[PDB]
Amino acid sequence: QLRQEAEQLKNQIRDARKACADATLSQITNNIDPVGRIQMRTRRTLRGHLAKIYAMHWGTDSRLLVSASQDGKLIIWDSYTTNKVHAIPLRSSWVMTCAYAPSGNYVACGGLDNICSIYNLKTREGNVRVSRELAGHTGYLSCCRFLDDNQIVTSSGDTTCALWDIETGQQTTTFTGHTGDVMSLSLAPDTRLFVSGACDASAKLWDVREGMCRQTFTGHESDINAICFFPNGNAFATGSDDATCRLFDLRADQELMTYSHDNIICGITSVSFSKSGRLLLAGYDDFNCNVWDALKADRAGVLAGHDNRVSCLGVTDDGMAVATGSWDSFLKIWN
Amino acid sequence: ARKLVEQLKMEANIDRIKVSKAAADLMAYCEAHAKEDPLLTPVPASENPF
Amino acid sequence: FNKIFLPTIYSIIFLTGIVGNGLVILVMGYQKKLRSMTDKYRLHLSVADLLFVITLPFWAVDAVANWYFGNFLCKAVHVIYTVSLYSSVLILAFISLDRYLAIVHATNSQRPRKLLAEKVVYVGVWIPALLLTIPDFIFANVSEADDRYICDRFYPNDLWVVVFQFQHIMVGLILPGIVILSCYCIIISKLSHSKGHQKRKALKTTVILILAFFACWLPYYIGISIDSFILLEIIKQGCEFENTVHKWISITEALAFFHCCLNPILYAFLGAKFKTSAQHALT
Amino acid sequence: SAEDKAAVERSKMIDRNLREDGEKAAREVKLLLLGAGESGKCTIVKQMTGIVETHFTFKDLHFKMFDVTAQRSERKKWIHCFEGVTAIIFCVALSDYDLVLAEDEEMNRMHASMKLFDSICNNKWFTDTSIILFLNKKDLFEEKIKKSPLTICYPEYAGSNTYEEAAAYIQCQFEDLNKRKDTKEIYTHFTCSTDTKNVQFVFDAVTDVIIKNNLKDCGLF
């Protein structure tokens, strides 16, 4: 009974999406000149991690970054001078994600322990101490992002994403609807919406305040491992295990372009954009990071400097540099 | 499946703009901020922190 | 025979030695990941063998035409030869001891293997080689014989010749030989019964290492021992015995010199982990 | 540049604390516990929220045991985190050949356990990682083998209903699932009542694994 109604609604949604597809992005992007061969070379090699690096996050000041690794250390670097600012020992050495607060006062963490830990970077004594540990997720915590000093949104392997109040350590809002493991998460520039790509090969758009799924995006054949908003917050790009990256527009409510090549057979571990969003940086299992042209799907460069799989990737807020970490226990700043 | 049907109905009654307009806005943003991107046009090494 | 054979045989080694030992240096130089205890030993061995290799072309020239480079350069090439020759065998003994610690005391020997590695490698390898070079500094001079200038280790009498040949045998052959033999024979015994594939590969590689070291260095030092006994009048034969013993020393000296190109194969190129490191460094 | 010199000095001291912590971690044994029906929270932890880490020291050697039973999510998305453990302790209940899953009535419990063992043994991450196999309830299995034939699981079992032969047959069936016989080993133990013998077996198996890893590291093969 309800299955037929769901199928009819899905067919109507597909028809509405197809009606809006007047001209493709590739059709109208032929006019603009292609981006030249983008050559970035490693400026700084941040050494000190002794295990696979699973995540990193830049600071808002675009100078300090936090990196998480399987050796149980959360290291805050000074990318300008390569100096290590902090080295936080973690309770569980199974970290899958880390975040850096926009104010710069806190760093988040989490992984197979199902717990998001907040560390106070700025203490009167001068050390770093656990501000609070957030518990309540049932599967592994795969991503976490700070809305502000008091709110953090986490995505977990229990197919749900949750919004937390760090002061009281309780889930203000729980986002449900994904079928598979939610593997990535990206906040909008205005922190009013966020997208999550899950193992159900689908991406969903959520309202932080209201708490329901605004839109659902499909098209990927395999698990979605990465997701990232466009700089203006009206679009996002996903990286999946089918060796494809795709761009979805929130207003158009459907895909516009696919970033794939026949030479690439391995999944994408991380995606990111440039300051203008022209370049779609993407990390791959083939030990390399590929620079795409977001407007015309053409490859514009390769950041091949890692001995192992590139697991994490990020671009500074001012756009000066891109940092790639990998399973070979090295971070590299490219400029 | 009442919740799923309600969610599908809620997601169906939204205003979808044409793909051409969304792509044009995306492109307009890309060229509007082209000069401020340090990765497209490299900055002089004098003003390069790295 | 003598003119043609020596330089030809002293050039095959130089080409292989400069390439084989150079390749290990670049692979270790271009290694992103952290060094292990065996990597540091391998770097030491590569540097020592490289010094020996750059020493050879002077001996080759001498064999073609006797020394005319000078007198300071003779002392420089004798000191370099002695440093490289003693440090190579001492590093081999140290590698043997490290492998003994890693295989026998696998779980409770990690701090000893690094204390050993850095501290004791310099103290027990590089320092005694320099002390052994000190008499090389005092007794290496150029002397003219007939109308030809030949330079070597010149001594006041045969007693100094004999005592320095005996100390050469002891340092070069006996101390590294005993450490390498005892350690690798204890290693092989613990790997003989096990039927695992990797343990069998390790056992055959260890046997290869022992055989290579002793087959490389044994005939040369046997000839040196016979020569020293000859100089002591303890053995008395016809002059043909002296000339044949000298031709044996000269013919097995090149076989001993083959170590500086065999070692990169045995201690670096045969290993699988070093192969993988070389594959990464290449790309 | 007083502030910059202070920053460099603190960076050097934290980097020198990182290196000693890395040495301490490298002097550790990390074992991953896996199991199908009883999930592996058997006597393995009795001997001595997402992941349960158990620390114990045996003969001057410190072990870390990771129990991943509470991770009900998809295993392919986090199993690579354990690439690099010293060994895997797989636990199999011997007295499960005639038992069936509550989720699927037509699925044999022991067949599901064998499928899990096969799936993790041939996983691309665990190619060089040896597996320690624990066969539990050996006394209960011996008691149960009289009344019921060992054919609910192995119709091809051409052997007597004796504990020794049936147990050896089961062990061989598990050991035949190792596709890559030459790069990893499977150590099998029939867990007994005394808990100082299971940990002794784990210690010996880890010692063998460490010896082989050292052989690879030392360039001896």
Ligand SMILES: CC(C)CCC[C@@H](C)[C@H]1CC[C@H]2[C@@H]3CC=C4C[C@@H](O)CC[C@]4(C)[C@H]3CC[C@]12C
């Ligand atoms: C001129 C001669 C007689 C001096 C002897 C040279 C020796 C002592 C020097 C030359 C090259 C040096 C090696 C090259 C680099 C490394 C990396 C270092 O992190 C560990 C030690 C190690 C392996 C060095 C140890 C000392 C070394 C072997």
